[PDB]
Amino acid sequence: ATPAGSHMRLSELASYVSGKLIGEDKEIKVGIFNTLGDANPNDIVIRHWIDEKGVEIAKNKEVSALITQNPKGNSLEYAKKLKVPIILVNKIELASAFAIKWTIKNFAPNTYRVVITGTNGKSTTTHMIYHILTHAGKKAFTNTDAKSEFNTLIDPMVAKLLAEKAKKENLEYLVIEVSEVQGWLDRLMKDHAYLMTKSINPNVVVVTNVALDHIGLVNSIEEVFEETSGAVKALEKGFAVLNYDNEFTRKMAKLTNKNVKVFFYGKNCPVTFKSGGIYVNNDLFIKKEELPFKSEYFIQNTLAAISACLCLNIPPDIIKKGILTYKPLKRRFSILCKKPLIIDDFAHNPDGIKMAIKSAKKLTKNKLWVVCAIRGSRGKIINKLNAESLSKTLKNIENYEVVITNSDDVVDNLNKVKKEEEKTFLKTLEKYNINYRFHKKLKTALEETLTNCKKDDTILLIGAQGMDPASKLLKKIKVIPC
Ligand SMILES: [Mg+2]
């Protein structure tokens, strides 16, 4: 069980988190689950690893207990002498999950709760739902904003941030993004989505889609489906909000438990997009020009957010006010310029690349330029599948030009394109008879594209870390602002 109150025994805490207590047992006062850098007296700190310096800082900060998987050097004996309790765990996600459960129970128990997962769209959908609720004046907590995506059990950040806000506000809603496929040291943390959803005990689970990505952690879309479905199996009550247009999210309906209602959104559903607008129960809800220059994914994410909020009994006019004032995250089909139309999108897996190209073509008057940064240091397979998606999506589209780059000039060591990655990407384009130009440097790719393009063309920039710097480079070479 999960205790209520601001005390527990060290031995009880160790058992709660699947750990072993190092040091003498004691009834401790508990503050919140925190990081070492921010810890207040009596806080409990969960950390992947600690060293003797961390033990000393914990003592100075009056931390009640340190929970860790790797006590480096002389940490254990040093902590025993300083009387800093160490709880050794093997599976740190169990400590983070307990920290979330305990924080909810003790600081925000009277809340409605939504979990959002999926391969693409879970951050935007989380952000949209949070925005609808807070724009309506509701008090809510979320673990994702424009700067951060704390969607895992690998650290205590969810428990820390939740506690900090719950002490200051009477929260009514928790809006929690959950990683569907999560790694640790390039190894799959199986059942992460199940465990993290269970720790929230949500009223609503949203699954945006199932798509191939995280090659190396997984390698089949079936496995992505299995791991993602853990969020739905975790749901005890309430509503499963599922994308009807994705085959694998549709299959999750059969996995819902006894007292769970499936709520589908998508084509020929109660919440749907058709003839340029969003409809709810056959009423025109959001109109075409209320969604200017928006992508396929933006629309699907909006359908998901509407659906989740309807399942929370938010009145439709409240939902609409939120949608119309939503401020999107960075590089989500971001319009940087209108003459020429420059679109900046962080597409990075086959589905996202396909979506971005098709959405850009829909808005394209004349020539479509696609500038794509190879996904460096992520493996040959994802780059092959990405080039395959780019090639298959473009092969029937008229009047395009492909510009490929390594972004060697702007990426760090962790994102450098490896020779085998560049090779599989470019050879895939050639297999599909896609003409292309290639530049090692992003700046070269952008300068040449913007020089040769015309004012009625569209320029689509796609890529992850390799394309992140494009906005600043376009300001640098004085393309932006237009
Ligand atoms: Mg998106």
Burial 23-61 (b: 16+ CB within 10 A, else e): beeeebebbbbbebeebeebbbbbbeebbbebbebbbeb
β-strand 187-188 against 183-184: which pairing, if any? antiparallel
**Which tokens in the block code for residue 77?**
């004996």
Query: Are the C-beta atoms of residues 390 and 402 closer than 8 Å to each other?
Result: yes
Nearest CA-CA partner of 164 in 35, 12, 3: 35
User: Omega of the bond prior to 316 within 30 degrees of 0, cis?
Assistant: no
In the reported structure, the alpha carbon of residue 456 is separated from the centroid of ligand 1 by a whole-number distance in angstroms of 26
Could you give the count of Cα atoms lying within 13 Å of 292 in the half-sphere of its Cβ?
7
What are the backbone angles phi and psi of residue 360, rounded to the nearest 5°? -65, -45
Nearest CA-CA partner of 179 in 158, 157, 152: 152
Query: Are the C-beta atoms of residues 458 and 367 closer than 8 Å to each other?
Result: yes
**Which tokens in the block code for residue 36?**
């070492």
In the reported structure, the alpha carbon of residue 382 is separated from the centroid of ligand 1 by a whole-number distance in angstroms of 19
Q: Say if residue 9 carries a ligand binding annotation.
A: no
| 3-state DSSP helix/strand/coil % of the chain, to nearest 5 | 40, 20, 40
Helices (H), 17-91: 52-60, 75-82
Region for residue 226 given its phi and psi (left: phi exceeds 0; alpha: psi -120 to 50; beta: otherwise): alpha
In the reported structure, the alpha carbon of residue 463 is separated from the centroid of ligand 1 by a whole-number distance in angstroms of 13
Sign for the pseudo-dihedral over CA of 436, 362, 331, 151 = negative
Sign for the pseudo-dihedral over CA of 428, 434, 436, 442 = negative
The DSSP line for 290-316 is GSTT--HHHHHHHHHHHHHHHHTT--H
Query: Are the C-beta atoms of residues 204 and 239 closer than 8 Å to each other?
Result: yes
CA 116 to CA 119: how far, in whole Å?
Answer: 10
The DSSP line for 225-288 is HHHHHHHHHH--SSEEEEETTSHHHHHGGGG--TT-EEEEESTTSSEEEETTEEEETTEEEE-G
The DSSP line for 450-469 is HHH--TT-EEEEE-STTTTT
What resolution does the deposited structure have, in angstroms?
1.8
Question: Which CATH number applies to 334-477?
Answer: 3.90.190.20
What are the backbone angles phi and psi of residue 134, rounded to the nearest 5°? -75, -35
CA 136 to CA 324: how far, in whole Å?
Answer: 12
- The domain locations on the chain are 95-325, 334-477
CA 451 to CA 455: how far, in whole Å?
Answer: 11
Number of helices (H), then strands (E), in the chain:
16, 24
Q: Say if residue 187 carries a ligand binding annotation.
A: yes
Burial 254-277 (b: 16+ CB within 10 A, else e): eebeeebebbbbbeebebbbeeeb
Query: Are the C-beta atoms of residues 421 and 378 closer than 8 Å to each other?
Result: yes
Q: Which CATH superfamily is domain 95-325 in?
A: Mur-like, catalytic domain (3.40.1190.10)
User: Omega of the bond prior to 481 within 30 degrees of 0, cis?
Assistant: yes
Burial class (CB in 10 A: 0-12, 13-18, 19+), 319: buried
β-strand 261-265 against 239-243: which pairing, if any? parallel
The experimental technique used to determine this model is X-ray
Which contacts of 280-286 are long-range, i.e. CB under 8 A and separated by 24 or more positions? Answer: 280/306, 280/310, 280/316, 285/316, 285/320, 286/320, 286/323, 286/324
β-strand 271-274 against 277-280: which pairing, if any? antiparallel
In the reported structure, the alpha carbon of residue 326 is separated from the centroid of ligand 1 by a whole-number distance in angstroms of 13
CA dist 334 → 300, 363, 367 (Å): 16, 13, 19
Q: Say if residue 49 carries a ligand binding annotation.
A: no
Q: Say if residue 182 carries a ligand binding annotation.
A: no
CA 202 to CA 213: how far, in whole Å?
Answer: 26
AA letter at 30 = V
AA letter at 160 = K
In the reported structure, the alpha carbon of residue 336 is separated from the centroid of ligand 1 by a whole-number distance in angstroms of 16
Q: How far apart are the first and last CA of the chain?
A: 59
In the reported structure, the alpha carbon of residue 120 is separated from the centroid of ligand 1 by a whole-number distance in angstroms of 6
